[PDB]
Amino acid sequence: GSSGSSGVQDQLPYSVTLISMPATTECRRGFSVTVESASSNYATTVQVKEVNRMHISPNNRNAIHPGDRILEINGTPVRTLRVEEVEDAIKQTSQTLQLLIEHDPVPQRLDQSGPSSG
């Protein structure tokens, strides 16, 4: 009922994020998204291309960010929401835009050169 994503049981840690902001301040949205369909017509995967902290806000700016992956939009599975659907949702510039970002515990894969010499 409440939650559910091909796995009700509990395994390994995880931190989910949810951002619910009203419209996008008129005009066009503030951030762009990527739609992958592999070799089909519907959606298969969504990724955050660009994101503006000014167009959005210092509140949802922490939750969302460029590089993450949108699991659900407005409270719906993108893995099922046809491309047009995944895009239309964004077009909505007069309604509460909900974005569910997934945050993993694992550390950020950075370089591999610490403080040399001792």
Side-chain angles (χ1 to χ4, degrees):
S2 254
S3 55
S5 272
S6 68
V8 275
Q9 319 98 351
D10 49 5
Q11 47 144 354
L12 279 124
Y14 232 44
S15 22
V16 163
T17 305
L18 198 288
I19 45 256
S20 310
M21 355 80 145
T24 82
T25 317
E26 319 156 68
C27 85
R28 58 261 214 64
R29 51 268 221 192
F31 71 96
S32 34
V33 305
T34 260
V35 167
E36 318 224 294
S37 55
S39 68
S40 209
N41 291 342
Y42 81 156
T44 232
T45 312
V46 193
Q47 280 111 330
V48 187
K49 209 214 122 149
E50 266 263 46
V51 193
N52 244 337
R53 314 139 251 275
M54 331 223 61
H55 279 149
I56 291 164
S57 262
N59 154 40
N60 303 292
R61 147 269 162 161
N62 189 313
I64 210 153
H65 258 326
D68 221 292
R69 44 180 131 172
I70 293 139
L71 325 174
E72 298 206 359
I73 299 184
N74 249 293
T76 16
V78 309
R79 58 191 277 178
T80 71
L81 281 188
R82 288 240 279 191
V83 170
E84 35 168 54
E85 249 58 295
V86 196
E87 284 258 270
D88 266 341
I90 322 314
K91 305 298 190 132
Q92 300 279 110
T93 64
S94 11
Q95 306 199 13
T96 359
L97 184 20
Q98 226 212 247
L99 308 158
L100 188 83
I101 323 312
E102 205 318 274
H103 256 309
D104 46 53
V106 16
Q108 176 220 146
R109 232 294 136 191
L110 229 123
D111 240 87
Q112 227 276 37
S113 306
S116 315
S117 343

